[PDB]
Amino acid sequence: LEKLTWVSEKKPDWSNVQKLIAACEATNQYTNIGPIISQLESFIRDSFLIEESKAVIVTSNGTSALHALVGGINRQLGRELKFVTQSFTFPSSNQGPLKDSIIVDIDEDGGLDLNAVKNIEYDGIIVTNIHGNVVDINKYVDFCMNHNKLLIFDNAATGYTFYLGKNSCNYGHASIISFHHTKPFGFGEGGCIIVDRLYENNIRIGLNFGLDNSLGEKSQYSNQASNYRMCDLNAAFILSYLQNNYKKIINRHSEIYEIYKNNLPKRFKLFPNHSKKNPVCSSICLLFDKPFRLDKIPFLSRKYYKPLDLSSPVSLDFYQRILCIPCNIDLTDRQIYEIIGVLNEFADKN
């Protein structure tokens, strides 16, 4: 267990990366949507099973995926949209165009508490599918349909979990994924928006300051936009990593979830998850039955997410009870069983 790493060891396939970036070299186009962007967006669409009704839009990072998604929709609708995010999530959904988002608690199933938005003025909600686990997506889709609200899934850590027969990224108006090095599908930095086609053109123009190349000299910036595009260099490293490893990651991460599911240590439960098939997790998240401190676990382990608003009791209860265990393609079954042994010993003494 001294050998545990958070992330599998990742190295460029240099001959493959050079083959991809040769198309940049040929045209001197390495950004502003060069020849690699379409290849990675196509690879994501076909490999992650994104539906035809959705755009696949790569961005510089998972954060810029969320911010470009919101910026683009704000520009299309002509106002700064007010979003609610859950406290039990990463800071990205209270930053950029979401810097004044309303923060509310989660319910005990891991997602934003729809009861907390009863008396609030807002335009949409952002629901986080934690570390590859999914919430009961239909209850958010129905709520947002009934109340004419936009629905975004923060799928930063959740690229290939299936809910009722399709990739969870295909639900709500939009979802985002992260290709940050720390993520299963990540290499360096990167993000992706999966979004209803109605907003696709404004979101793409929104990566380029709001400047529509189709208008030529008549293009006009939007104060809702920024520089949010993915560089073709980064697209090549991410595409090469996925071409060489995507299949092994989806299979092994499912195999790793399978061992914990069938061999749960005493007084630990799996994090709430609504997928029939095993999720593809960024870490294996267990909930101990009472608060505990990370320093009592003698192997590499973390707590996510530190609540954005400390006045959210369910979020804090989860933070206090969660254990996030490394989940990557370098982990051995021997290590998984030894981890389950250590948590059984921890359970005995606490």
Ligand X SMILES: Cc1ncc(COP(=O)(O)O)c(CN)c1O
Ligand Y SMILES: Cc1cn([C@H]2C[C@H](O)[C@@H](COP(=O)(O)OP(=O)(O)O)O2)c(=O)[nH]c1=O
Q: Return the residue nearest ligand Y (CB atom).
A: 32
* Extended beta strands in 100-256, E state: 102-104, 124-128, 150-154, 162-163, 166-167, 174-178, 191-196
User: Which residues, 112 to 131, sit near ligand X by CB under 6 A?
Assistant: 128
Is the distance from CB of 167 to CB of 52 less than 8 angstroms?
no
Q: CB nearer to ligand X: give 175 or 275.
A: 175
DSSP state of 101: P
Q: Give the residues across from 269 on adjacent strands.
A: 287
Q: How far is the CB of 145 from a copy of itself (least distance, A)?
A: 30
Measured distance between the N- and C-terminal CA atoms of the chain, rounded to whole angstroms: 21
Residue 85 makes contact with ligand X by CB under 6 A:
no
Choose the binding region for ligand X from 35-43, 59-67, 95-103, 283-291 (rule: CB under 6 A).
59-67
Q: How far is the CB of 265 from ligand X (least distance, A)?
A: 25
Q: Which amino acid is at 314?
A: V
Which DSSP helix (H) or strand (E) runs through 192?
strand 191-196
Q: Which of 87, 168, 178, 328 binds ligand X (CB under 6 A)?
A: 178
Residues in the chain: 350
How do beta strands 150-154 and 124-128 pair? parallel
Q: CB nearer to ligand X: give 89 or 273.
A: 89
Q: How far is the CB of 308 from ligand X (least distance, A)?
A: 11
Tokens of residue 146, six digits: 């009934």
Choose the binding region for ligand X from 75-83, 86-94, 108-116, 286-294 (rule: CB under 6 A).
86-94
Is the distance from CB of 167 to CB of 50 less than 8 angstroms?
yes
User: Which residues, 23 to 82, sit near ligand Y by CB under 6 A?
Assistant: 28-32, 34
Residue 276: name its binding partner from ligand Y, a copy of itself, Cl ion, none (Cβ under 5 to 8 Å by kind). Answer: Cl ion
Binding track over 213-252 against ligand X, x by CB under 6 A: --------------x-------------------------
Q: At what angle do helices 333-349 and 232-262 cross, to 10 degrees?
A: 60
Please report, as ranges, the residues that interact with Cl ion according to CB under 5 A.
163, 275-276
- What is the radius of gyration, based on Cα positions, of the chain? 20
Choose the binding region for ligand X from 132-140, 154-162, 194-202, 229-237 (rule: CB under 6 A).
154-162
Q: How far is the CB of 193 from ligand Y (least distance, A)?
A: 20
Tokens of residue 227, six digits: 């520089």
Q: What is the Cα–Cα distance from 344 to 268, expressed in whole angstroms?
A: 9
Residue 240: name its binding partner from Cl ion, ligand X, ligand Y, none (Cβ under 5 to 8 Å by kind). Answer: none
User: Which residues, 53 to 112, sit near a copy of itself by CB under 8 A?
Assistant: 60-64, 67, 90-92, 94-96, 99-100
Q: At what angle do helices 37-48 and 232-262 cross, to 10 degrees?
A: 20
Cis link prior to 305 (omega < 30° from 0)? yes
Q: What is the Cα–Cα distance from 241 to 69, expressed in whole angstroms?
A: 25
Phi, psi of 154 (to 5 degrees): -80, 95
Residues in contact with ligand X, counted by CB under 6 A, come to a total of 14
Q: Which of 226, 240, 245, 273 binds a copy of itself (CB under 8 A)?
A: 226
Would you tell me which residues interact with ligand Y (CB under 6 A)? 6-7, 28-32, 34, 181-182
Q: Kindly list the residues in this chain that would bind ligand X in the complex (CB under 6 A).
A: 61-63, 89-90, 92, 128, 154, 156-157, 178, 180, 191, 227
